[PDB]
Amino acid sequence: SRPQVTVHSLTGEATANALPLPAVFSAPIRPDIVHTVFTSVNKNKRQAYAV
Amino acid sequence: QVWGSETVASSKVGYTLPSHIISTSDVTRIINSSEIQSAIRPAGQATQKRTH
Amino acid sequence: GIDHTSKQHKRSGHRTAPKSDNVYLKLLVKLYTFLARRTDAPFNKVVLKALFLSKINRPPVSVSRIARALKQEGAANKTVVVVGTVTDDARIFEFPKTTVAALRFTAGARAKIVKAGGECITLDQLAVRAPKGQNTLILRGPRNSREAVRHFGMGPHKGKAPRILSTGRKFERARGRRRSKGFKV
Amino acid sequence: AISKNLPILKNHFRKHWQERVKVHFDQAGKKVSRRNARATRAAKIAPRP
Amino acid sequence: PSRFTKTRKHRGHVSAGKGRIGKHRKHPGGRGMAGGQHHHRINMDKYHPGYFGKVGMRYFHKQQAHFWKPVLNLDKLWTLIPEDKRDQYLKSASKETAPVIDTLAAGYGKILGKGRIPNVPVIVKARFVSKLAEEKIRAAGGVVELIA
Amino acid sequence: AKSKNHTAHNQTRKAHRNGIKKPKTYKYPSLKGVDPKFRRNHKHALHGTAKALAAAKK
RNA sequence: AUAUUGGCGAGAGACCGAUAGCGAACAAGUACAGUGAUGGAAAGAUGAAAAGAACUUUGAAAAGAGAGUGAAAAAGUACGUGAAAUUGUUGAAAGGGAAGGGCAUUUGAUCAGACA
RNA sequence: CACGGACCAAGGAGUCUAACGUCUAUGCGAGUGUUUGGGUGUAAAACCCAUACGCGUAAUGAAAGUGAACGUAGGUUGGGGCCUCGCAAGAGGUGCACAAUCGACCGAUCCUGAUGUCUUCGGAUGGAUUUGAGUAAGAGCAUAGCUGUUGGGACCCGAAAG
RNA sequence: AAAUAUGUAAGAAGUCCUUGUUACUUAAUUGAACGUGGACAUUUGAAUGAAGAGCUUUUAGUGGGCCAUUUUUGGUAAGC
């Protein structure tokens, strides 16, 4: 019922193990909300300046 | 566990992964499926002939 | 030179597309431009305009209003369309089947309809089930129930709620509101 | 001074207020200071809670 | 966002949206609320009736904790039961098993009778109630217990 | 230092840029200024006849 | 627990970048002014390294021309780059109490684009 | 035959903040707001959170106080969309938002003032050319943005004065 | 007693017939108001046009005016 992502080993060599999707990836993709949230959130490690 | 699903919910108080306002992000399939194509008139031309 | 009977280059005064940068609502708009263009159904033209609408002009439709409208005669089996948001109302306790289609359902309204058995549907699903909008009720919601409309038309002898930040005695109950102090309104 | 239908406003900025502005840039710094205080107290002091 | 402003668009234009005749000036009608009785009287009448004068009685040293009495309507009474138990009590409407509701515990000092709870018995513990609330609850088979 | 006291010049142009519109009459106007005796009786009459329809038409 | 543009010690910035930023990036609270209280500046940059031009010649000297050092003196301590106003020389063009501009063409000068 | 301007460079004038309104976008939605603070941290970021508190869900009245369904939450007139008949024109049914209107409900005011009993308390019931910034199946809360308002050096420069 | 200027109307929220409610009114189920029900429809009740009709919110600048034809006051007149 979910696309069954396969797991991969450190030296390549794809494993015989497969896990379902956690549904975070079927969440909606909203570039506009990511945009607004990013602007406001990247303003938040700012440091004051003044003459 | 962190972000929730239809089964699990926990790790965020009353949080629910948001809900789609459209079942299919591909509109060609919807338009071309069966019933719309039944229910629509025939089409014309992508660019019209010029008259006069 | 021309004596114009009207203003030139006047726009229609109507929103021809949504301001929202929402990919999915633009996709809905694409679908319904196609349908209104190819179906000769008034329903889809209506739904297209209502997609273009703004938020205050898409006020939420209560599930109780849905029930009220399904208590119409011949309308229990109509799919109830809301181009907007369907909110819940615990003030009802007996709620019917209600096939309901809308952009957004709250958790409460979703739960309520699914618990009564009905189905909560997107407008693309509605299109697939109903290209001409067969067997439908469009439900708009209340626009002139707003705190802002409470204030429009503010003048003497019109009764439309001053703009005021602190309500009570000492705040605009005196002169102009009562004959004992000068005059009333 | 007075204009269209707007609410009557009461803003108390007629004193020398920008001689007494306090902006809380010290918020996170004081949080870290407060945590280190609690931790160094709980160390220095005892097995007490 | 300074760049999505109109000072940007008025760069080049002499007066900057303010006129060649008024020649934007500092306080050319006064500051704040100068003139409510003289030269802004028509503003204050029409859009602010009531502003000037006294109204009633003074309360020296008034607490609002005294007057704390937030209200609840019968149409929102059943919202005070957990949703898990609400259907349980709603079905099987039986005295000797009637729900109890701590309205004060929920944060409500008075209970009002707006509209039409179901015909189920309920025990409503409230400091105050209205007459129609009492009537509607007793008609639906409940009772109001008064508390402090 | 004398002024131009009064003139009604340009004022019809101003009034007609937005047009002298009729007040947009309606059916069922306000019964304001209408005699209270009539108003009371008329209330009781409307109540009676609407009651007749509600109490006869099944 | 709270305050803390002074002091001391540390770390940072969607800050300014030498008409900016502290008045002060420099022997700056200096030079200077004023009886005094007080007022109060301007001023950074050769080059990797002085390698800072040995030597000849002219000149009374300053300097110049050469030579030369140097990747470069189209870097010579009047020094990174080196705009403009303003000026010199050369060249070109026009000019009967202004010049300048627009449309259109002559004349002169200069200039790109193209046949597989 | 009004003012300023000899020339060049560089500099140079609607900004920020607190509270706000209209509109818009977004999030959740009869609720919303994590960021006072606590936890955590690859550290002044990101991540997580209890109790509250604010605004909203109930107004009205100077207050004491009281406090929102006669009725499928009313009737009428219109009303898009849908439903039925028809090939259509058109006919009927249902009709959200919205407009107008006659009503009902809540509070204030003025009246009527019953059954009763600290016999002056009580307030049923029924009214009205009266009145509210109300109800009549909630819409708001928060973030952000242009424009606009108020206080502020408040677009920049500018007094005589105190 | 004009000319010019001006109000109203030129029908669907209409006309016709029968008939309900009322606490108003009448000597009187006579009237008044709102109505049920039925009848008249596409030359539905002049002309022309209708670069869409209706509605709302918010906000800028302005709030020194001048000229001409015609009417007209003051003034001998005036680019008053």
UniProtKB/Swiss-Prot annotation, chain A:
Compartments in which it is found: Cytoplasm; Nucleus
Superkingdom of this protein's organism: Eukaryota
PTM statement from Swiss-Prot or TrEMBL: N-terminally acetylated by acetyltransferase NatA.
N-acetylserine modification, residue list: S1
Assembly information from the UniProt record: Component of the large ribosomal subunit (LSU). Mature yeast ribosomes consist of a small (40S) and a large (60S) subunit. The 40S small subunit contains 1 molecule of ribosomal RNA (18S rRNA) and 33 different proteins (encoded by 57 genes). The large 60S subunit contains 3 rRNA molecules (25S, 5.8S and 5S rRNA) and 46 different proteins (encoded by 81 genes). uL4 is associated with the polypeptide exit tunnel. uL4 interacts with its chaperone ACL4 and the nuclear import receptor KAP104.
Function according to Swiss-Prot or TrEMBL: Component of the ribosome, a large ribonucleoprotein complex responsible for the synthesis of proteins in the cell. The small ribosomal subunit (SSU) binds messenger RNAs (mRNAs) and translates the encoded message by selecting cognate aminoacyl-transfer RNA (tRNA) molecules. The large subunit (LSU) contains the ribosomal catalytic site termed the peptidyl transferase center (PTC), which catalyzes the formation of peptide bonds, thereby polymerizing the amino acids delivered by tRNAs into a polypeptide chain.
Recorded family membership: Belongs to the universal ribosomal protein uL4 family.
Other remarks on this protein: There are 2 genes for uL4 in yeast.
Protein name: Large ribosomal subunit protein uL4A
Gene name of the record: RPL4A
Swiss-Prot record, chain D:
Entry keyword Ribosomal protein: yes
GO biological process: cytoplasmic translation
Keyword Cytoplasm: yes
Gene Ontology CC: one annotated term: cytosolic large ribosomal subunit
Keywords: Cytoplasm, Phosphoprotein, Ribonucleoprotein, Ribosomal protein
Protein location: Cytoplasm
GO molecular function: RNA binding; structural constituent of ribosome
Other noteworthy facts: Present with 133000 molecules/cell in log phase SD medium.
Family: Belongs to the eukaryotic ribosomal protein eL13 family.
Function: Component of the ribosome, a large ribonucleoprotein complex responsible for the synthesis of proteins in the cell. The small ribosomal subunit (SSU) binds messenger RNAs (mRNAs) and translates the encoded message by selecting cognate aminoacyl-transfer RNA (tRNA) molecules. The large subunit (LSU) contains the ribosomal catalytic site termed the peptidyl transferase center (PTC), which catalyzes the formation of peptide bonds, thereby polymerizing the amino acids delivered by tRNAs into a polypeptide chain.
UniProt protein name: Large ribosomal subunit protein eL13A
Organism: Saccharomyces cerevisiae (strain ATCC 204508 / S288c) (Baker's yeast)
Gene: RPL13A
Curated annotation (Swiss-Prot), chain E:
Gene3D superfamilies for the chain: 3.100.10.10
GO CC aspect terms: cytoplasm; cytosol; cytosolic large ribosomal subunit; nucleus
Sequence ranges of Basic residues compositional bias: 1-13, 20-29
Entry's localization field: Cytoplasm
Main location: cytoplasm
A Pfam family assignment: Ribosomal_L27A
Top-rank taxon, per record: Eukaryota
Keyword Calcium: no
Keyword Metal-binding applies: no
Motif window: Nuclear localization signal: 6-12, 23-29
Protein's GO biological process: cytoplasmic translation
Keywords attached to this entry: Cytoplasm, Isopeptide bond, Ribonucleoprotein, Ribosomal protein, Ubl conjugation
GO MF term (any one): structural constituent of ribosome
Annotated stretches, region: Disordered: 1-38
Record InterPro entries: Ribosomal_uL15 (IPR030878), Ribosomal_uL15/eL18 (IPR021131), Ribosomal_uL15/eL18_sf (IPR036227), Ribosomal_uL15_CS (IPR001196)
Covalent cross-link site, Glycyl lysine isopeptide (Lys-Gly) (interchain with G-Cter in ubiquitin): K95
Family (UniProt): Belongs to the universal ribosomal protein uL15 family.
Subunit organization: Component of the large ribosomal subunit (LSU). Mature yeast ribosomes consist of a small (40S) and a large (60S) subunit. The 40S small subunit contains 1 molecule of ribosomal RNA (18S rRNA) and 33 different proteins (encoded by 57 genes). The large 60S subunit contains 3 rRNA molecules (25S, 5.8S and 5S rRNA) and 46 different proteins (encoded by 81 genes).
Protein name: Large ribosomal subunit protein uL15
Organism of origin: Saccharomyces cerevisiae (strain ATCC 204508 / S288c) (Baker's yeast)
Gene giving rise to this polypeptide: RPL28
Curated annotation (Swiss-Prot), chain F:
Protein name as it appears in the record: Large ribosomal subunit protein eL29
Subunit structure: Component of the large ribosomal subunit (LSU). Mature yeast ribosomes consist of a small (40S) and a large (60S) subunit. The 40S small subunit contains 1 molecule of ribosomal RNA (18S rRNA) and 33 different proteins (encoded by 57 genes). The large 60S subunit contains 3 rRNA molecules (25S, 5.8S and 5S rRNA) and 46 different proteins (encoded by 81 genes).
Remarks, miscellaneous: Present with 51100 molecules/cell in log phase SD medium.
Recorded GO MF terms: structural constituent of ribosome
Residue location of crosslink Glycyl lysine isopeptide (Lys-Gly) (interchain with G-Cter in ubiquitin): K51
Annotated Basic residues bias: 1-25
Protein family: Belongs to the eukaryotic ribosomal protein eL29 family.
Keyword Ubl conjugation appears in the UniProt entry: yes
UniProt entry tagged with the keyword DNA-binding: no
UniProt KW keywords: Cytoplasm, Isopeptide bond, Ribonucleoprotein, Ribosomal protein, Ubl conjugation
Superkingdom to which the source organism belongs: Eukaryota
Primary location group: cytoplasm
Disordered, as annotated region: 1-36
Pfam families, alphabetized: Ribosomal_L29e
Coiled coil feature spans: none
GO cellular component assignments: cytoplasm; cytosol; cytosolic large ribosomal subunit
Record's subcellular location: Cytoplasm
GO biological process terms held by the UniProt record: cytoplasmic translation
